[PDB]
């Protein structure tokens, strides 16, 4: 599996949203090594924690300018893959 060490160097969100994203990433990485499923779980946690609508994008070599509401872009990096949970809603 993957020991999801949430290296949130720049988590442009509140502590509760960052903790929710970290817990979702940890559970998803424990369950499976699927990047899309991990991003989906982070998106579900963000939708639970910061209301509709929320989404999370995870990639290895990806570029996406996080454009959402403030305290709604949960960015915890499981190593280097930053699961940017920018809640666009």
């Amino acid at each position: 599996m993957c020991d999801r060490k949430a290296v949130i160097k720049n988590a442009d969100m509140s502590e509760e949203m960052q903790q929710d994203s970290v817990e979702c990433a940890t559970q998803a990485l424990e369950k499976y090594n699927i990047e899309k499923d991990i991003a989906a779980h982070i998106k579900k946690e963000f939708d639970k924690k910061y209301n509709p609508t929320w989404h999370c994008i995870v990639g290895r070599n990806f570029g996406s300018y996080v454009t959402h509401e403030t305290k709604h872009f949960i960015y915890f990096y499981l190593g280097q893959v930053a699961i940017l949970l920018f809640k666009s809603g």
Binding site: V58, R60, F62, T67, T70, F73, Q80
Partner: protein, 31 residues
């Protein structure tokens, strides 16, 4: 019927707080 000026009920809803910023972001790259 005598009518005159008075004070009306001042009830209002404060707006929400939100900031929209398209800040450049990219995940860290490891070989």
């Amino acid at each position: 019927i005598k009518l005159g000026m008075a004070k009306i009920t001042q009830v209002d809803f404060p707006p929400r707080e939100i900031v929209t910023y398209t800040k450049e972001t990219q995940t860290p790259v490891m070989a």
